Amino acid sequence: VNMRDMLKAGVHFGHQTRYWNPKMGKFIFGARNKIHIINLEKTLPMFNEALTFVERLAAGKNKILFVGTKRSAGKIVREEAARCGMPYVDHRWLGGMLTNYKTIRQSIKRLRDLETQSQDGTFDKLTKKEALMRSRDLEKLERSLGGIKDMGGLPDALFVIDVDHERIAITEANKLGIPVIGVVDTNSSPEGVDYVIPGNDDAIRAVQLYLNSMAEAVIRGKQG
RNA sequence: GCUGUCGUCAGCUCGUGUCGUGAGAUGUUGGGUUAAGUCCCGUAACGAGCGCAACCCUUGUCCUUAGUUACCAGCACCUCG
Ligand SMILES: [Mg+2]
Ligand SMILES: [Mg+2]
Ligand SMILES: [Mg+2]
Ligand SMILES: [Mg+2]
Ligand SMILES: [Mg+2]
Ligand SMILES: [Mg+2]
Ligand SMILES: [Mg+2]
Ligand SMILES: [Mg+2]
Ligand SMILES: [Mg+2]
Ligand SMILES: [Mg+2]
Structure with a gap:
């Protein structure tokens, strides 16, 4: 989007040069100041490809699950994945x-029953120990499976913010065989993801920019 | 069928998932804490069962119900029980 803007935010920043993966050497503009710099002139075409792919796919009542768990990075995903549907995880x-x-599914059903009991008019009208225990179990179940309450089926697409941090999710998606959208970093691994995006991590501006791009992308692609 | 013993020690397993060509392994490992696989947070594991704890009996405080063959604060009789 208009180049300079992410050139201001955080995108042209790589995880040093001691810790790097040669598999994406083709995405590297050139290491400077003991830091690898991503080739910004090449990421944007593939970024727009991911944008149009997700926008076209969303038309048809399709849900794309977002994963953003990280140090202080899941909180932004909590509301960016909020609205326009888009089930997510944050922990x-x-x-x-x-x-x-x-x-x-059993855990989801148990959480639903627990929250319905909690909000029915405070059914837990007994000793404060029991009510507190039920409440903390309920909030733990929320922290674990908040974004999975909907989408009784399996998602037909999946988006990742740091492909290295959640390699388990990418492995599961490959085993099931569903497309994966991924923000990859110079020390991450390019394979497994079907629509790779060579960006940057650990930058709040960068993650927020990607999240907004895709949020309004699915918004404008779900008009029908 | 019934019983001792390890031992009233805290252990013993399963379903689905995952790793290994396999026997198997993860769950059940780590840092704490507890009498306890008791609990917390982490964590390719997510749950469940038999165990632990709880529900049972007795004792230790108090309230109500009730005063016979039980008791005697108060009144009286008293042959002073
Ligand atoms: Mg196998
Ligand atoms: Mg072994
Ligand atoms: Mg073993
Ligand atoms: Mg072993
Ligand atoms: Mg086994
Ligand atoms: Mg097993
Ligand atoms: Mg064991
Ligand atoms: Mg084992
Ligand atoms: Mg137990
Ligand atoms: Mg017991």
């Missing part, structure tokens, strides 16, 4: 939400 990705979805 530690518990392995098995895709291959073992049958087990996860």
Whole structure:
């Protein structure tokens, strides 16, 4: 989008040069000041390809699950994935939400029953110890499976903000065989993702920019 | 069928998922804490069962119900029980 803007935010920044992956040497503009710099002139065409792919796919009542768990990075995803549907996760990705979805459905149902009991008019009208225990279990279940309450089926697409941090999710998606959108970094691994985006991590501006791009992308692609 | 013992020690397993060509392994490992696989947070695991704890009996405080063959604060009789 208009070049300079992400050239201001954080995008042309790589994870040093001691810790790097040669598999994406073709995406590197050239290391300067002991830091690898991503080739900004090449990312944007593929970024727009991902934009149009997700916009076209969203038309048809399609849900794309977002993953953004990280140090102070899940909080922005919490509301960026909010609205326009788009189920998400915001905490530690518990392995098995895709291959073992049958087990996860029981946890979803239990959480729904617990929250319905909690909000029915405060059914927990008994000793404060029992009510507090139920409340903390309920909030733990929320922190784990808040964004999965909807989407009883399996998602047909998936978006990642740091492909190295959640390699479990990419492995699960490959095993199930669903497309993956990924923001990759110079120390990450390009394979597994079907629409790779060579950006930057650890930059709040960068993650927010990608999230807004895709949020209004799915907004304008879901007009029908 | 019934019983001892390890031992009233905190352990013993399963479903789905995942890793390994396999026997198998993860869950059940880590840092704390507890009498306890008790609990917290982390964590390719997510859940469940038999165990631990709880529900049972007795004792230790108090309230109500009730005063016979039980008791005697107060009144009286008293042959002073
Ligand atoms: Mg195998
Ligand atoms: Mg071994
Ligand atoms: Mg073993
Ligand atoms: Mg072993
Ligand atoms: Mg086994
Ligand atoms: Mg097993
Ligand atoms: Mg064991
Ligand atoms: Mg084992
Ligand atoms: Mg237990
Ligand atoms: Mg017991």
